[PDB]
Amino acid sequence: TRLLAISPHLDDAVLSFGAGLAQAAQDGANVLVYTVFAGAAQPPYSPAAQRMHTIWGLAPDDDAVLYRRKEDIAALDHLRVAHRHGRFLDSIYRKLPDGRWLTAHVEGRQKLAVNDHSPDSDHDLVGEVADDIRSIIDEFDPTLVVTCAAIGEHPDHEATRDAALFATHEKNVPVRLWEDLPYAVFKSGAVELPQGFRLGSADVSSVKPEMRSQKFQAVERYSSQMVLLNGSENNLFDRLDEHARQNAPHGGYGETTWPVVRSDDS
């Protein structure tokens, strides 16, 4: 078993699928977690990115990607799994064809806005990511790929998911999507996939207490994300536990995943 996890950002795979990853490694699978939007970034940073760096406990002009890459390696090392850091820039670092930043801070507004841009630029990014995933599939030869459902509709999550669907389809490799956490605690769960793909029946995993502990300890390695993830209740792990309990009342901890299959008539 060769399991390739494809994470949009440096944290998503562990938050969403860390128990699954840790399980797979125990069961003797060869596990690699490739993060798409782990591309090196350097100043000048946008006001929005500088604001994010501050929220992450860094100075505005710190090399945030380096800090986050080191966190990811610690987290994945804790799960006893391999890492691979991709070349693509997080949405907060990307520019539009016209030279504007992709993402902007709006005075008063907490949530960051995305600037309008052409169909083509979106298409091009997904195409590039798909190219890199195809290359990694050739190199690593996975028997299973897992990536995000993009619950919560983060553009980087949607780009990752779509690129993985295209690449795995072309390469004829089985693929599953995980339930994005903690996003799924606040969103309906429904997603719109690219034409021709659909979700099969959910699997809700059941993992031993030791794996839950390992997952949660691994999440803690992402120091930069802790304040953001815990919120003003300081209750990330409680919310994750409650979410799992909802989906398995007579169970222990678990993670929801769906197989992705081809639609009828496609």
Binding site for Zn(2+), by residue number, is 9, 12, 83, 90, 117, 122, 156-157, 179, 243
What does residue 181 show for φ and ψ, rounded to 5 degrees? -115, 145
Query: Does position 86 bind Zn ion by CB under 5 A?
Result: no
Q: Exposure of 249 by Cβ count < 10 A (0-12 exposed, 13-18 middle, 19+ buried)?
A: exposed
> Nearer to Zn ion by C-beta: 8 or 86?
8
Q: How many residues make up the chain in this entry?
A: 266
Contacting range for Zn ion; rule: CB under 5 A; set: 8-16, 27-35, 68-76, 78-86: 8-16
12 interacts with Zn ion by CB under 5 A: yes
Candidate residues 3, 5, 6, 9; the one interacting with Zn ion per rule CB under 5 A: 9
Q: Which stretch binds Zn ion (CB under 5 A): 2-10, 85-93, 106-114, 171-179?
A: 2-10
* Segment contacting Zn ion by CB under 5 A, of 9-17, 117-125, 127-135, 206-214: 9-17
Nearest residue to the partner Zn ion, using Cβ: 9
Using the rule CB under 5 A, is 158 a contact of Zn ion? no
Which residue in 38, 28, 30 sits closest to 7, CA to CA?
38
